[PDB]
Scaffold this active site. Structure first.
Site, PDB file in Angstrom:
ATOM      1  N   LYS A  14      27.802  60.064  17.414  1.00 29.27           N
ATOM      2  CA  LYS A  14      27.020  60.598  17.267  1.00 29.27           C
ATOM      3  C   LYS A  14      26.138  59.844  16.594  1.00 29.27           C
ATOM      4  CE  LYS A  14      28.016  65.085  16.380  1.00 29.27           C
ATOM      5  NZ  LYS A  14      27.798  66.434  15.936  1.00 29.27           N
ATOM      6  N   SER A  63      23.736  60.895  14.491  1.00 32.14           N
ATOM      7  CA  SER A  63      23.104  61.995  13.652  1.00 32.14           C
ATOM      8  C   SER A  63      21.608  62.646  14.180  1.00 32.14           C
ATOM      9  CB  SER A  63      22.589  61.239  12.206  1.00 32.14           C
ATOM     10  OG  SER A  63      22.653  62.318  11.315  1.00 32.14           O
ATOM     11  N   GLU A  97      23.003  62.276  20.364  1.00 33.17           N
ATOM     12  CA  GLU A  97      24.733  61.759  20.787  1.00 33.17           C
ATOM     13  C   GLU A  97      24.348  60.359  21.363  1.00 33.17           C
ATOM     14  OE1 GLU A  97      25.525  64.994  23.459  1.00 33.17           O
ATOM     15  OE2 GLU A  97      27.068  65.460  22.314  1.00 33.17           O
ATOM     16  N   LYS A 137      21.302  56.321  23.077  1.00 31.76           N
ATOM     17  CA  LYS A 137      21.132  57.581  22.399  1.00 31.76           C
ATOM     18  C   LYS A 137      20.214  58.489  23.131  1.00 31.76           C
ATOM     19  CE  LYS A 137      19.151  57.025  18.466  1.00 31.76           C
ATOM     20  NZ  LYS A 137      18.898  56.573  17.100  1.00 31.76           N
ATOM     21  N   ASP A 154      18.587  51.315   5.083  1.00 29.52           N
ATOM     22  CA  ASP A 154      19.749  51.860   5.013  1.00 29.52           C
ATOM     23  C   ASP A 154      21.009  50.732   5.397  1.00 29.52           C
ATOM     24  OD1 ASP A 154      21.604  53.968   4.952  1.00 29.52           O
ATOM     25  OD2 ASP A 154      21.452  54.829   6.876  1.00 29.52           O
TER      26      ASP A 154
HETATM   27  C1  LIG Z   1      38.739  50.865  19.525  1.00 30.82           C
HETATM   28  N1  LIG Z   1      37.520  50.935  19.789  1.00 30.82           N
HETATM   29  C2  LIG Z   1      36.709  52.095  19.899  1.00 30.82           C
HETATM   30  C3  LIG Z   1      35.482  51.855  20.966  1.00 30.82           C
HETATM   31  N2  LIG Z   1      34.609  51.150  20.076  1.00 30.82           N
HETATM   32  C4  LIG Z   1      33.234  50.996  20.705  1.00 30.82           C
HETATM   33  C5  LIG Z   1      32.194  51.379  19.569  1.00 30.82           C
HETATM   34  O1  LIG Z   1      31.210  51.895  20.344  1.00 30.82           O
HETATM   35  C6  LIG Z   1      29.718  51.906  19.976  1.00 30.82           C
HETATM   36  C7  LIG Z   1      29.142  53.172  19.204  1.00 30.82           C
HETATM   37  C8  LIG Z   1      27.861  52.979  19.091  1.00 30.82           C
HETATM   38  O2  LIG Z   1      27.293  54.422  18.249  1.00 30.82           O
HETATM   39  C9  LIG Z   1      27.225  54.260  16.899  1.00 30.82           C
HETATM   40  C10 LIG Z   1      26.986  55.496  16.343  1.00 30.82           C
HETATM   41  C11 LIG Z   1      26.513  55.292  14.972  1.00 30.82           C
HETATM   42  O3  LIG Z   1      27.698  54.743  14.203  1.00 30.82           O
HETATM   43  C12 LIG Z   1      28.065  53.578  14.798  1.00 30.82           C
HETATM   44  C13 LIG Z   1      28.537  53.554  16.112  1.00 30.82           C
HETATM   45  C14 LIG Z   1      26.985  52.020  19.244  1.00 30.82           C
HETATM   46  C15 LIG Z   1      25.627  51.897  18.934  1.00 30.82           C
HETATM   47  N3  LIG Z   1      24.642  53.111  18.717  1.00 30.82           N
HETATM   48  C16 LIG Z   1      23.275  53.227  18.281  1.00 30.82           C
HETATM   49  C17 LIG Z   1      22.811  53.258  16.916  1.00 30.82           C
HETATM   50 CL1  LIG Z   1      23.728  52.881  15.458  1.00 30.82          CL
HETATM   51  C18 LIG Z   1      21.631  53.360  16.733  1.00 30.82           C
HETATM   52  C19 LIG Z   1      20.885  53.519  17.723  1.00 30.82           C
HETATM   53  C20 LIG Z   1      21.252  53.577  19.206  1.00 30.82           C
HETATM   54  C21 LIG Z   1      22.616  53.448  19.431  1.00 30.82           C
HETATM   55  O4  LIG Z   1      23.040  53.631  20.823  1.00 30.82           O
HETATM   56  C22 LIG Z   1      21.769  53.399  21.447  1.00 30.82           C
HETATM   57  O5  LIG Z   1      20.669  53.684  20.558  1.00 30.82           O
HETATM   58  N4  LIG Z   1      24.831  50.857  19.558  1.00 30.82           N
HETATM   59  C23 LIG Z   1      25.503  49.656  19.928  1.00 30.82           C
HETATM   60  N5  LIG Z   1      27.058  49.811  20.353  1.00 30.82           N
HETATM   61  C24 LIG Z   1      27.472  50.879  20.031  1.00 30.82           C
HETATM   62  C25 LIG Z   1      28.945  51.060  20.583  1.00 30.82           C
HETATM   63  C26 LIG Z   1      35.396  49.943  19.679  1.00 30.82           C
HETATM   64  C27 LIG Z   1      36.551  50.303  18.717  1.00 30.82           C
END
Ligand SMILES: CN1CCN(CCOc2cc(OC3CCOCC3)c3c(Nc4c(Cl)ccc5c4OCO5)ncnc3c2)CC1
Length: 288
Positions: free
Chosen positions: A21, A23, A26, A42, A133
């Site tokens: 998520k 915030s 999703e 996102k 941030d």
């Molecule tokens: C054992 N393992 C579990 C799987 N894992 C993979 C990690 O997956 C992500 C998650 C993301 O979402 C974020 C949500 C906020 O906290 C940090 C994780 C990713 C991400 N987020 C994101 C954010 Cl923070 C801001 C704007 C966005 C985003 O997506 C598209 O627009 N971005 C890129 N990769 C993500 C991978 C590994 C460990």
């Protein structure tokens, strides 16, 4: 406004499973159907999140202007009915905060992570942008240890007519005193946050982590700046001290910190950080 908004995202991308998520909305894993590279999507319900819309617009704008290996790559924003898709590069190694969860880092890992954060801040600050941030949770890693700044949800932009910001944004434990006071501030606020992030990387948690966030809103402007306490090298302690000056003009720039003794003596190849990524996967897998 947002000139390069696109449409029909599912013609170009496949939406896969939820992975977190943001915030705002999703976050989903996805596939670029052109390259078969994995992306992070996102999805923001515009009907629901009504007064963060100005923040959404801000996040999009900032991202569309960044082009750096040290900043999460931005594919584009796509309108789809009542939904906005913000499509970005997928980073599979987790966040720096995640990598802390199984246990302590050593100073080589701390320096390596900080050096890459610093390259990101140098880029942003050279573009008159302020992240606002900076914290381990907003530092994401690829599965092979590349380190990038993420979550530009409250990023600020300086201009010729606006040389400082004053908006109350960020995360309390990591916020600079001048930001809490809502004084006129600039990129030097990120340098304070970096110092708290250094303590967070070293100790696992920022100063005051057990207190209610509202408490720290008076503690941080009042108290002397935090120092790094414990059995850490002198250059690491001095690195933190350098960042955590109450007077912003006395903090070094990101450029300057990249030449700090702690960074030069200890930072090594980012690929070595796969050891940390593997440690987390192992830990996460056996977690009950
Ligand atoms: C054992 N393992 C579990 C799987 N894992 C993979 C990690 O997956 C992500 C998650 C993301 O979402 C974020 C949500 C906020 O906290 C940090 C994780 C990713 C991400 N987020 C994101 C954010 Cl923070 C801001 C704007 C966005 C985003 O997506 C598209 O627009 N971005 C890129 N990769 C993500 C991978 C590994 C460990």
């Amino acid at each position: 406004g947002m000139q390069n908004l696109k449409a029909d995202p599912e013609e170009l991308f496949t939406k896969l499973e939820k992975i977190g998520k943001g915030s705002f909305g999703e976050v989903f894993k996805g596939i670029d159907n052109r390259t078969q590279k994995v992306v992070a999507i996102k999805i923001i319900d515009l009907e629901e999140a009504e007064d963060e819309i100005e923040d959404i617009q801000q996040e999009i704008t900032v991202l569309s202007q960044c082009d750096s290996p040290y900043v999460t790559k931005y594919y584009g924003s796509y309108l789809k009915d009542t939904k906005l898709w913000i499509i970005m590069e997928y980073l599979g190694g987790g966040s720096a905060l995640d990598l802390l969860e199984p246990g302590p880092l050593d100073e080589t890992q701390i320096a390596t992570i900080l050096r890459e954060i610093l390259k990101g801040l140098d880029y942003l600050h050279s573009e008159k942008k302020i992240h606002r941030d900076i914290k381990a949770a907003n530092v994401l890693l690829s599965e092979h240890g590349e380190v990038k700044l993420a979550d530009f949800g409250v990023a600020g932009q300086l201009t010729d007519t606006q040389i400082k910001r004053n908006t109350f944004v960020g995360t309390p434990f990591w916020m600079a005193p001048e930001v809490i006071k809502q004084s006129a501030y600039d990129s030097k606020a990120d340098i304070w946050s970096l110092g708290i992030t250094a303590i967070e990387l070293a100790r696992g948690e920022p100063p005051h982590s057990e207190l209610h966030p509202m408490k720290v809103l008076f503690l941080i402007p009042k108290n002397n700046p935090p120092t790094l306490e414990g059995n850490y090298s002198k250059p690491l302690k001095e690195f933190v001290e350098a960042c955590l000056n109450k007077e912003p003009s006395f903090r070094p720039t990101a450029k300057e910190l990249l030449k700090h003794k702690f960074i030069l003596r200890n930072a090594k190849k980012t690929s070595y950080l796969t050891e940390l990524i593997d440690r987390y996967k192992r830990w996460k897998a056996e977690q009950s």
